[PDB]
Each structure stands twice: as C-alpha cells, then as structure tokens.
Amino acid sequence: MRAKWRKKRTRRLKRKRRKVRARSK
Amino acid sequence: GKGKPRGLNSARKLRVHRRNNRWAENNYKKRLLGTAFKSSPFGGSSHAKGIVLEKLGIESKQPNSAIRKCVRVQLIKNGKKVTAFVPNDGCLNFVD
Amino acid sequence: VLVQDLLHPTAASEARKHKLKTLVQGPRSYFLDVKCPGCLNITTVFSHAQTAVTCESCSTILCTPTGGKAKLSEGTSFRRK
Amino acid sequence: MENDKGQLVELYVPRKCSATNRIIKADDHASVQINVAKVDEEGRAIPGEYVTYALSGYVRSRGESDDSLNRLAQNDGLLKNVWSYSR
Amino acid sequence: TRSSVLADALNAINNAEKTGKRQVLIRPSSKVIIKFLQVMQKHGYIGEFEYIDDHRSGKIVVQLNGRLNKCGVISPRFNVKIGDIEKWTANLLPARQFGYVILTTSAGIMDHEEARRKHVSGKILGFVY
Amino acid sequence: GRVRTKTVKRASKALIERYYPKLTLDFQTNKRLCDEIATIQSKRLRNKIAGYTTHLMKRIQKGPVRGISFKLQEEERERKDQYVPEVSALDLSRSNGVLNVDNQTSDLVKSLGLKLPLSVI
Amino acid sequence: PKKRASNGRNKKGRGHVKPVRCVNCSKSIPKDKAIKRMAIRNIVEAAAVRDLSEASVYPEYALPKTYNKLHYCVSCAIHARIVRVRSREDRKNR
Amino acid sequence: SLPATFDLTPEDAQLLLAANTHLGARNVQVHQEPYVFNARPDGVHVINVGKTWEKLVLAARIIAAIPNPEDVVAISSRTFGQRAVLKFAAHTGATPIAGRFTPGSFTNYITRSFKEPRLVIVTDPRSDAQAIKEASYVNIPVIALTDLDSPSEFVDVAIPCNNRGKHSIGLIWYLLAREVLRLRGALVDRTQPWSIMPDLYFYRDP
Amino acid sequence: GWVPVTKLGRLVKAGKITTIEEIFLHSLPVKEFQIIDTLLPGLQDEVMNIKPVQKQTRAGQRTRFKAVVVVGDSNGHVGLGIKTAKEVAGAIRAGIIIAKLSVIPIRRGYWGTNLGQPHSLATKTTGKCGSVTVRLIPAPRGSGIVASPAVKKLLQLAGVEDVYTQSNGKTRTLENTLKAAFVAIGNTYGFLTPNLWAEQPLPVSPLDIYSDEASA
RNA sequence: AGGGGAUCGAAGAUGAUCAGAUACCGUCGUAGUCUUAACCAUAAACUAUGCCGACUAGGGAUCGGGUGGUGUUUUUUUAAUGACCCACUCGGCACCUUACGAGAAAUCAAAGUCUUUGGGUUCUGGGGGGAGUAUGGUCGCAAGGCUGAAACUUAAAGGAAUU
C-alpha cells in the first residue's frame, strides 16, 4: 500500500486511540 | 576533515559522538539494557528447566512440509510459557 | 605548462592580470595633475576621486564622481604624474 | 639496488622520462622514445649518432609533450629559439 | 577561513606534482614553511626555493624535481615520544630505507632520524617521501 | 527481388579486375568466355555471373565507380597525376612581382630574414 | 537512478516557477516544464490561397497568418507525437 | 645544432607567405601552442614563419633518423591531402594509407593491412584521432600537422600549419619531402632547390 | 612452424634477444605467447577456479566458463589470464595464453636488514580493481606469506618470501582480488627508490640497431 | 474572528461506463481559492549533493561591474551621454569534449587532491519489518509539531548496469 494512505490510516488510528484514552481517563 | 573533530582538545566531543553512536550495535544495547536478563525467557541462562503443558503441531515454512511435533512448556523460575522442538526423531511418544 | 617563469613574466601579462593576481600587489590607479581654466591653481587629484572636488579658490569642479575613474572637467588640463 | 657484498642485485634497471623524472613502467603502453640524428657539416645525418629523448605517457596524456620536446631540443642545442622560459 | 598554512601549501605542492609542473608557488609564506622547504632542500627532495619578500606575508616560488613522490602533513601535532616515534615512522613511511618524518623538538626542525640522533622529540609536523 | 548474391558479386568483380581485355559488352560471347575460364559447377550460377559481369561492363564503361582496379584505372592514375600547368600554380607569379600580405605578416617578415617583396596594404 | 542531468527542465538556482495550464488536458505544469511549440500557421489552408485570391474583393492584399504558442505537457506531447522518445545517446543533442 | 645551412631561405619564405600558411584559425586556440603571433583585427591569427621552419627541420631529422624508409607512415583522411601524401611517399619511400583507415591494422595481426611504423606523420589529429590511438597503443611517436583549433593531445612533434586549403598543406608536404631528401643525401646540393615543381603535390578538385 | 607476424618475433627467434629484461626495459609491445615461453621456459601455470557464468537467451540460458589462471617463474615474473569460453579446457588454455602475454616484473627489496638476498617488496603498495583494495607491506625475515590462499599462491609464484597483506572490500570476488593484487604487483615498480635517483645513460631500442634482421 | 466571495472547486447532488464504480467522463455545487488581525512550523522544503578556505585539463556563450581601443554608430556629419564590436579582469547562473583522478556503476572539474589514508568544523545511519509506533515530556484552540523505544519476526530486504 502507498505510504501516504498508510500514514493517513495511522493518523486515524492515533485519533481513535487518543479518544479511547481520553474517555478512559 | 572527514566530518569529524580533529583538534587536540576535541576528545570530549569525539567521546560523546562515540557513546551516542555505539547504541546502534545490537550487542552493546543488549548488554547495557539487560534485555536478556529481563525480556528473554531464559533470563540470560544457557539452560532452563520447565514442565510440559501440551503438545503442538506447527507447520513448516517455505519450500517444505512436515509436522515438527513440538511441545509447550512452562518455566518454573520465570513462570512464562515457552515453545520447544525435540531435536531427535520419534521422541514425542517418549515425552509425556 | 610544464615550465614557465613566475619570477619575471611578461609585462603584458602582468598588465592584463588583476591587481591582486600579480607577483607584488600594487594599485593600478594613479594621481593626476589638473590645471583650471583662467587661473592655474595646480593641484593633485586621484583617478577615482569619488567626490566632486573643486578648486581651492574657485567654484569650478575639478572632476565628477563615477563608479570607475572619476570624469574630469573638459576645460581642465590632464597630466600624468 | 646494492647489497653489502657489492654485487649488483635486482634486474630491470629502469629509465626515466626526460621532461619529468618519473620512472617509465614496463606495462606502460603510451610512451615513445624520440631520437634525433646528427649532421656533420654537410647536411647528411651520420647513422648511429642519434640523441635520445625519453617521453613518458603521462605528459602525452596531458598534451604537453610537444612543449617538453621543444624545451629539450633548445636546451641541448638541437633548437635555437621557439621555446621561451618567460612564455 | 585559513586553518593550516602547512597543510594548504603541502596540498599545493602535491597537486603541482600530480599535474607534473616543474615549479609551484606557496601563498601563505610561514616560517615553518621555509623550515620545511630547507628540510626538503638539504636532503634533495626539492631543488631551489626562493621567497618573494614584499611588505606583506610574501610568497614562495620553488622549482621541483621528479624525486618528491608524496608529501603529507599531520594536522593535529601529537606529542610523540621516544617509544612511539618508531611506530609512527613505520606507519607513515613505505619503508625504513627511505622517507623522513619531520617534527618540532626542543632544538628546532629536523627529521625523525636527526631527532633520534639528538635524543629529542616534540610535536610532529608531517611526512615526506 | 533480383538482388545478386555476394558470391556472384565477388566472382564478377574478380573477373572485371582481371579480364578487361577479355570481357566485352555482348552477353553471349562473355558467357562462353566464362564457360571456358571460370570453372563453375552449375549452368545457372555461371550464367548469373556472366549477366552480372555484362551489367558491370555497361555500368563502368561510362566511368569507374568503386573498388575495381581493372588494369586501366591505375594507368589513368599514373598518367593524369603530374599536370604542372606552368607558372599558374600560384607561386611568386600572377602578380606584379610582389606578395600581397597584411600589416602583421609584414612586420613578421621584416623581423625575420625578410628578402621578400612585401605589399602590406 | 539519475536518468537526466537536468531533473525536470532548465531550472537551476531558481526554485519555484509560476505554473501554466496545458492547452488540451488543462494540467498545471511549471512554465519551463511545458513543451512550448511556436506554431505559426495560416488562417487559409493549403491549396486554398489560389481559390481565395480571385474570389476576394480588392486585388492581392489579405495574405495574413495566425500565430499561437501551445504549452503541451509531457503526456500530451507523447500522445500527440509532438516529441518522440529516442535512444540514450541521442538525448544529449541540442 | 646545424651547420648554418638549415636557415630561413628567402625562396621558401616567399613560398610560405604566398601559400597563406601563416593564416591560422579563428579565436579558438589551445594554450599548448604558443606559436601564434599577435592576432589580426578580422579574427585570423598569424603564425611566425621561423617556428614553422624549425618544426619542419626537426620533423625531417626525425624522419631521416629512421634507418628503414618504409617504416615511415603517412596517413591523411581529408581529400585535400591524399595526393600530397601520395607524392610524399612516392618521393621518400614509405607507404601511403590515404583514404579511409581501417581500425585494428596497427594492433590486430589478423588483418592483411598490418604495418607497424617507427613514427607517424599524421596530418589532422581530429579526423585521424583513431590512428593516433592506434599509434599510442603500439607505441609509435607522433608528428602531427596541428592547427590552432586542432587538439594537441598525444603529439610528440607539432607542426604549426593551416590545415584548411590544399595549397598550404601540399607546399609544406613538398618542403618536408625536400629537406628529408636532402638529409638522406639523394640531393647533393642543399643550397640548390629540388628539381620538381611543388604543384604536383596539390590534388585535383575534379 | 612459427612465421612471426611481428618483427620482435623474428628478432627473438633469431636468437638476438635472450632475456626478458631486454624487452621489459624498453616496454616493447608483445602479441605472441610463443615469445614469452621462448625467453621464459620456466613459467609454471596454475588455475584458481572455474566460474560457471550464464546468460539468458531466447529459449534457454547459455552457459560459459570463466577461467582464472596465473603463470610466472618464482624469480620475478607474474602474469594473470581471464577468459570466458564454451568449454573448460579451452578456457584454461586461453587463460594460460593471456597470462603468458601479461607478464609484469615485480620490484623486490629488503625489510631494512641489508644482509642477504631480497625477500620482500621494497615499499608498501596498493592495488584496486573494482572495490577491493589489496595492500602489500614489507615483512621481516621468517614471517612468510600472510594472505588468502589465492594471493599466497600468487606471491609464492612471484618468488617473495615475507609479506604482509591487508584487504578491504568484497574479497568474495576472487577475480577482482587477483586483479587488484596484479595492479599492486605492477605498481610496486612505480615507487622512486633513492637508488634510482642517479641518472644513467639512456639505452636505444633494439630494432633501430637490428633493423637488418627485422621484417624481411 | 471580519470583508469579499468573479472563475476553479475536496464533501455532496445527478447523468453516463461497467457484473459491480461510492472513481476516471458530463452538469451543478458548500468549505476553500482573494484580502485584514492571530495560530498551524509541515513537503520529492531536491541541487535527494553542509559551511568556510588552498590547488588541479581545456572551450564557447551569458548577467552585473571595471580598464584600454589612431574601433563602429547615434547625435549638433564631428563634444558629452548612450547602443554596439575587439582584448583583459572580478564576482554569479550555468553549458560542451574529455578523465590527470574519484566512484560498485549511473556519473562527477567536483562526487578530485581518501589504503601515497590527517585543512577546521556541525548533524545524521549500523540488515529489512515492528515504527516514525507506544509511552514519558514539550508547544498548539484544533488537526497536529519536536524528542523518541522495547517486545516479537525474517534471511534476505536493497543500489547500479548486462541478456
């Protein structure tokens, strides 16, 4: 897969993880 | 000058660069961090004892096909689970 | 060139080369003798004067400033030192 | 090359180029040996009395061999005036 | 800017010898430079060198022969001693039959052999062969 | 097509470069001549060579073309090689006894041994 | 690798160049990167000047021309045969 | 050293002046040839006659020093000097290789055109550079009819010359043949000119 | 049946030129292995290995054999031959011919004792053919040959006794390492030892004197 | 957060093509594209080439400046002032043939003066993934920016050229 789209998916996963951590704390 | 300090009083800078660059070595990093003593299942030991939990039948990698007939063990000294493969032929029945 | 004399090269080469590129660094400029029309008022000026130098007793401009050699007045006399 | 005994040791005594004192290699394949015959008061060149100039291949590769030959001839008297030190 | 006068000059002579020219010009004109040139001249590695003396730093014009194969300079002047001068000469020199390593001892400027003859040492300037 | 094979081409040029007095411009007679001289196994082959030689004769009767040397080309070369049309070779003539040169060449010649009629303009 | 000494076009020491749009595909390309063809044609086609002369008011005259500068991108030029690919050695010419 | 007889004689001087030998190339000129004398306002450079004459006499000495005359190799690629080198060979032995030079003759021994020289008088270095490479690979000294714009690469002997025009090249070829013949001794009278008109060397245009 | 095409072949066949030093001093070109094995009857051949190179074709892969060969008596002469041929025997023969045609003298020398016969190189030498840098350094008496098996065989065939060799780069390229050693062994003569600083009379090439026997 | 918001125009609305088309193609169309006061600190931000200083094969053209032309033209046929041509020089964008050399090659007058190893100096990298991820800090309204692993897995991942 293209590095740009992989990076975009990484940013989406980072946002999801940050939201999960914020809702947990 | 090969991109490195060469003055007679740049020994500190050279030593700092050497210390920073040495961390890239696998042996250097492993020796100082002690990952063998905390992360490795054997804890830096050449040999380790355990007890057999159950058998396992993992398949083969590229170009070949065989059932290796391995065994899972639990280390007493660490408490972790380990996969091991018997070296000789036809000893799975011998192992209980 | 395998062999060439850097001790006493040709005067033409030393003249065509830049001032700082010769054997001995020296100014290629020179001073001037100027005579004002009417009254002599002999005095020495410099080639690239960079100023509108006038006579010490007259309002006539000895030379005008320019980027290169300063342009001298048409009526003023020109003499090498 | 000499030893304590005084006898000659090592073979292949090498030559050096006249223009530049660099040893000519045996494996070198870009060098020639210029030779000029000498006349004796009659315009006729006496055989076997030629003078020899050694020219390495490096000066040839740099294209300075002609100037080197003119200098050598002028210095040896084979030539009179084409070569000037001042240049 | 200018860092090592001896290094820049020695590079100039090395480039001139690589080109093949029979003479070269040294710009910086340092006393150590004239000392180095005397060291070459007294041993025959170069020919005649003269120093253009203006009211400024000056220059040098030196005629070379086809006898200087390689000259180099050790920029960090390490304080070599009696013990390590042999290993330094072995490392720098192609052989001990020829080649000379020059160093500033208490007496002055001379080669490694003369320095060992006088039993003195100091900082190391460079190598020549 | 009807492109001649290199073997018959070589045979034809060998015949041309050797037997010009023997070769003629009539096909049948030189075909018989090839029959006598050239030892060719097959009639079609020798006939093709004879035809090629006839074509070459017709072509080079007008003039030489390429790589022939037919025992008369070198005759012409060694005959029409020394022309020397008298004093019309542009040397010390075709003028008023003077050499028209430029100013720099004039200073060059007088700096040299001179002994020449300079006409610098 | 380094297929060409000039990476895109003759852009050394400049950096950013104002871009232009292709004539047909309307693609934005740097001005120097556009293959520019100085097309100088006639608004009367071939074999038509003869018929257009005697059928025109006033004798002779007219004879005008059209002049347009076409900025073709690399892909459009390749497709329209404006510029043709050649060998490695032929690239260095002109 | 020469016995005061190999000097600039007026007859050859006027011949060279009338042949426009001194007129060189345009502003392009290699620094390796300082034979250029001043520069005309039009753009043509002047070559001093004495330098040319000394170079011719030196090349003649080189040619005459070779014992076997057929070791002399003269090759020309341009059509302006084919007849010149042909007549030079006809008068000084040698072998003419005028025309198109087949590569590999000097190095490869399979070809039937093998002839290793002791020197070459290659005329135009640019057009006959392949012959220069062969002579280098087989270690043959090079004498080149160089020009101001002509390269000075792999040239032991350089002949300042104007390589454009049949007249100048034919005249200098004839002169070279004349003085090498005098050196070889067939011409007993060095002062007397050759009894052969130099027009024979120049080729015929049609 | 010799019929030497080159004039030097006729000269050596006439018995006028006897030693390899005569041709090596003047660097006269040689094109026949018969000349080399005539003036050097003691040359011994050795082959390191045979590389089975392949090249893809329309409907298969053509296989050729590359043979790397060395020759030269243990008295100051070495030569290397590289050749790809269809058959291994022909490749070996052609490599032998090339190695014979590529003889180069070696400059020997003393470590600094000045007591007996030469046993090492005069100066430290370097050689690179590709990305391999073979370095030769003088060694004291009794040290021996310290190198790879191939370089050790080459230097024993050369005739030196004590050497110190250091290599950098992909030493796996055996042909490259041998060619680098060849370059260094040929360059060892390029150094200007002070014994050569004296100016000697310049000799003349043999053909000028012996042109009568040449050609014809 | 304001003004403006003519064209283009992510989202979206339709009509095509296709087994499917949420795209490539046709028409509209919000944010945006423009401007003011503040954040964003990023890119193939490339010349994938660090800065300063010395030397090294040639050739032509060009930009800015300077000097000399028994030079041309423009003027007031002729002074100035300019615009041209010839020669030289400094500082730049660069270009062409070659390789004394470098490089694995593509190629480089610098990527040279590095196994004949040292001009001064800063930064970055030690097999490929994991991963520019998690965590610990820091800046930012926000998206995100800087520093930055480990566990685990593999024997090939790669670069240049040849058929």
User: How many Å apart are CA C78 and CA C33, to the nearest integer?
Assistant: 6
Burial per residue of G45-71, b for 16 or more beta-carbon CB atoms within 10 angstroms, e otherwise: eeeeeeeeeeeeeeeeeeeeeeeeebb
Q: Tell me the sheet residues that pair with C33.
A: C44, C79
Q: How far is I126 from chain D (nearest CA, A)?
A: 16
Residue of E18, E21, E22 to mutate, testing the D interface (most D Cβ within 10 Å of its Cβ): E22
Q: Is residue I206 situated within a structural domain?
A: no
For residues D29 and I29, is the Cβ–Cβ distance under 8 A? yes
User: How many Å apart are CA G41 and CA D66, to the nearest integer?
Assistant: 57
Quick one: which of I39, I181, I47, I80 has its CA closest to I121? I181
Radius of gyration for the alpha carbons in chain D, expressed in angstroms and rounded? 17
Residue nearest to nucleotide J90 (CA to C1'): C18
Angle between helices E31-43 and E5-19 (to 10 degrees): 40
E66–D22 CB contact, under 8 Å: yes
Quick one: which of I78, I47, I74, I52 has its CA closest to I63? I52
User: How many Å apart are CA H119 and CA H141, to the nearest integer?
Assistant: 5
Closest by Cβ to E54, choosing from C4, C6, C24:
C24
For residues I68 and I175, is the Cβ–Cβ distance under 8 A? yes
User: How many Å apart are CA A6 and CA A14, to the nearest integer?
Assistant: 12
CB contacts under 8 A, E 46-85 vs D, are 65-67
Contacts with B28 (C-beta within 8 Å, 6 or more apart), sequence order: B22
I127 and I173 inside one domain: yes
User: How many Å apart are CA F87 and CA F54, to the nearest integer?
Assistant: 45
- What residue type is assigned to position H199 of the chain? D
Helix (H) or strand (E) holding A15, with range, is helix A3-24
Minimum CA–CA partner of D19 in chain H: H156
- What residue type is assigned to position I62 of the chain? R
Contacts with I81 (C-beta within 8 Å, 6 or more apart), sequence order: I67, I68, I69, I70, I71, I94, I95, I96, I97, I98, I99, I100, I101, I102
> Is the four-CA dihedral H138, H143, H145, H148 of positive or negative sign?
positive
For residues D15 and D28, is the Cβ–Cβ distance under 8 A? no
Nucleotide in closest CA–C1' contact with I58: J163
Quick one: which of D34, D22, D66 has its CA closest to I204? D34
> Is the four-CA dihedral B23, B26, B28, B30 of positive or negative sign?
positive
Q: How far is C48 from chain E (nearest CA, A)?
A: 25
Q: Where would I find the H helices in chain I? A: 7-13, 20-26, 33-39, 88-101, 149-158, 174-187, 206-209
Q: How far is H15 from chain D (nearest CA, A)?
A: 21
Angle between helices F43-62 and F27-37 (to 10 degrees): 120
Which of strand J's nucleotides are less than 7 A from any protein C-beta? 46-48, 50, 52-61, 65-68, 79-81, 86-90, 92-97, 99-108, 111-127, 131-135, 143-144, 150-152, 154-155, 159-161, 163
Q: Which of I46, I74, I105 is the last residue of a domain?
A: I105
CA of A15 to C1' of J24 (A): 31
- The DSSP call for residue G31 is T
Chain H residue numbers touching I28 (CB-CB < 8 A): 139
Counting the structural domains of chain H, the total is 1
C24–E20 CB contact, under 8 Å: no
Counting the structural domains of chain I, the total is 2
Contacts with I158 (C-beta within 8 Å, 6 or more apart), sequence order: I72, I74, I76, I77, I78, I106, I185
Quick one: which of D21, D26, D14 has its CA closest to D59? D21
Contacts with F86 (C-beta within 8 Å, 6 or more apart), sequence order: none
Using DSSP's 3-state secondary structure scheme, residue C48 falls into coil
Using DSSP's 3-state secondary structure scheme, residue C5 falls into coil
Residue of H57, H137, H152 to mutate, testing the D interface (most D Cβ within 10 Å of its Cβ): H152
Minimum CA–CA partner of D58 in chain H: H154
I146 and I76 inside one domain: no
**How many C-beta neighbours within 10 Å does residue F80 have?**
9
Quick one: which of E82, E67, E79, E74 has its CA closest to E127? E74
Residue by residue, what is the 3-state secondary structure of chain B? CCCCCCCCCCHHHHHHHHHHHHCCCHHHHHHHHCHHHHCCCCCCCCCCCEEEEEEECCCCCCCCCCCCCEEEEEECCCCCEEEECCCCCCCCCCCC
**How many C-beta neighbours within 10 Å does residue I87 have?**
10
Residue linked to tokens 């590709």: I130
The residue count for chain H: 206
Using DSSP's 3-state secondary structure scheme, residue E108 falls into coil
Let me know if chains H and F touch, i.e. at least 3 Cβ pairs under 8 angstroms.
yes
> Is the four-CA dihedral I116, I121, I122, I123 of positive or negative sign?
negative
Using DSSP's 3-state secondary structure scheme, residue H83 falls into helix
For residues I69 and I95, is the Cβ–Cβ distance under 8 A? yes
Q: How far is E127 from chain I (nearest CA, A)?
A: 15
Chain I residue numbers touching E69 (CB-CB < 8 A): 191-192
Q: Angle at CA F101, nearest 5°, toward F99 and F107?
A: 110
User: How many Å apart are CA F109 and CA F106, to the nearest integer?
Assistant: 5
Quick one: which of H125, H147, H159 has its CA closest to H55? H159
Q: Is residue H2 situated within a structural domain?
A: no
For residues E24 and E46, is the Cβ–Cβ distance under 8 A? no
Residue of F84, F94, F112, F118 to mutate, testing the H interface (most H Cβ within 10 Å of its Cβ): F112
Contacts with H38 (C-beta within 8 Å, 6 or more apart), sequence order: F104, H45, H46
**How many C-beta neighbours within 10 Å does residue I128 have?**
16
CA of G81 to C1' of J18 (A): 31
Is F104 part of the contact surface with chain H (CB cutoff 8 Å)? yes
Quick one: which of D65, D77, D79, D73 has its CA closest to D19? D65
Q: What is the DSSP string of H8-61?
A: --HHHHHHHHHTT-SB--SS---TT-TTEE---SSS--EE-HHHHHHHHHHHHH
CA E83 to chain centre: 22
Is H67 part of the contact surface with chain I (CB cutoff 8 Å)? yes
Quick one: which of H171, H128, H135 has its CA closest to H151? H128
Tell me which residue range forms the domain holding D58: 1-87
Two structure tokens written together for C27: 């100014």
- The DSSP call for residue D25 is P
I29–H139 CB contact, under 8 Å: yes
**How far is residue B16 from each of residues B12, B13, B20, H75, measured CA to CA in Å?**
6, 5, 6, 69
User: How many Å apart are CA I182 and CA I192, to the nearest integer?
Assistant: 19
Residue linked to tokens 């190198």: I147
I157 and I186 inside one domain: yes
Burial per residue of H170-205, b for 16 or more beta-carbon CB atoms within 10 angstroms, e otherwise: bbbbbbbbbbbbbbbeebeebeeebebbbbbbbbee
Two structure tokens written together for H17: 């002046």
> Is the four-CA dihedral G2, G7, G9, G10 of positive or negative sign?
negative
Is E98 part of the contact surface with chain I (CB cutoff 8 Å)? yes
Angle between helices F6-18 and F43-62 (to 10 degrees): 60
Tell me which residue range forms the domain holding H141: 12-206
For residues I20 and I40, is the Cβ–Cβ distance under 8 A? yes
User: How many Å apart are CA I137 and CA I169, to the nearest integer?
Assistant: 18
Q: What is the CATH number of the domain that holds D41?
A: 3.30.1230.20
Q: What is the DSSP string of chain F?
A: --PPPHHHHHHHHHHHHH-TTT--S-HHHHHHHHHHHS--S-HHHHHHHHHHHHHHHHHHHH---SS---SSHHHHHHHTT----TT-SSSS-SSSS-B---HHHHHHHHHTT--S-B---
Q: What's this structure's resolution in Å? A: 3.4
I170 and I87 inside one domain: no
H109–I31 CB contact, under 8 Å: yes
> Phi and psi (nearest 5°) for E25?
-120, 130
Tell me which residue range forms the domain holding I165: 108-196
I115 and I178 inside one domain: yes
- What residue type is assigned to position H191 of the chain? T
Q: Find the chain I residues whose C-beta atoms sit closer than 8 A to any C-beta of E.
A: 109-112, 122-124, 138, 191-194, 197
Using DSSP's 3-state secondary structure scheme, residue E23 falls into strand
User: How many Å apart are CA I142 and CA I116, to the nearest integer?
Assistant: 13
Q: Which of I105, I138, I170 is the last residue of a domain?
A: I105
Q: Is residue H6 situated within a structural domain?
A: no
Q: Is residue H145 situated within a structural domain?
A: yes
> Is the four-CA dihedral F40, F42, F43, F44 of positive or negative sign?
negative
Burial per residue of A5-18, b for 16 or more beta-carbon CB atoms within 10 angstroms, e otherwise: eeeeeeeeeeeeee
I17: left (phi over 0), alpha (psi -120 to 50) or beta: beta
C23–E56 CB contact, under 8 Å: no
User: How many Å apart are CA C60 and CA C40, to the nearest integer?
Assistant: 12
For residues E33 and D33, is the Cβ–Cβ distance under 8 A? no
**How far is residue G12 from each of residues G4, G8, H144, measured CA to CA in Å?**
14, 10, 42
Helix (H) or strand (E) holding G74, with range, is helix G74-80
> Is the four-CA dihedral H149, H154, H160, H161 of positive or negative sign?
negative
For residues H104 and H111, is the Cβ–Cβ distance under 8 A? yes
Q: Is residue I212 situated within a structural domain?
A: no
> Phi and psi (nearest 5°) for E5?
-60, -45
Nucleotide in closest CA–C1' contact with A12: J143
Q: Is the CB of B26 less than 7 A from some atom of nucleic acid strand J?
A: yes
> Phi and psi (nearest 5°) for E122?
175, -145
The DSSP bridge pattern shows strands E71-73 and E49-52 to be: unpaired
User: How many Å apart are CA G54 and CA G48, to the nearest integer?
Assistant: 11
User: How many Å apart are CA G86 and CA B96, to the nearest integer?
Assistant: 74
CA of E92 to C1' of J117 (A): 10
Minimum CA–CA partner of C5 in chain E: E23
For residues I108 and I88, is the Cβ–Cβ distance under 8 A? no
Is F101 part of the contact surface with chain H (CB cutoff 8 Å)? yes
User: How many Å apart are CA H190 and CA F58, to the nearest integer?
Assistant: 53
Q: What is the DSSP string of E28-90?
A: S--HHHHHHHHHHHHHTSS--EEEE--SSS-EEEEE--TT---EEE-SS--B--HHHHHHHHH
Contacts with I2 (C-beta within 8 Å, 6 or more apart), sequence order: I9, I13, I34
User: How many Å apart are CA C53 and CA C49, to the nearest integer?
Assistant: 8
For residues D28 and D57, is the Cβ–Cβ distance under 8 A? yes
Counting the structural domains of chain D, the total is 1
Burial (0-12, 13-18, 19+ Cβ within 10 Å), C70: buried
User: How many Å apart are CA D36 and CA D54, to the nearest integer?
Assistant: 12
User: How many Å apart are CA I201 and CA I216, to the nearest integer?
Assistant: 31
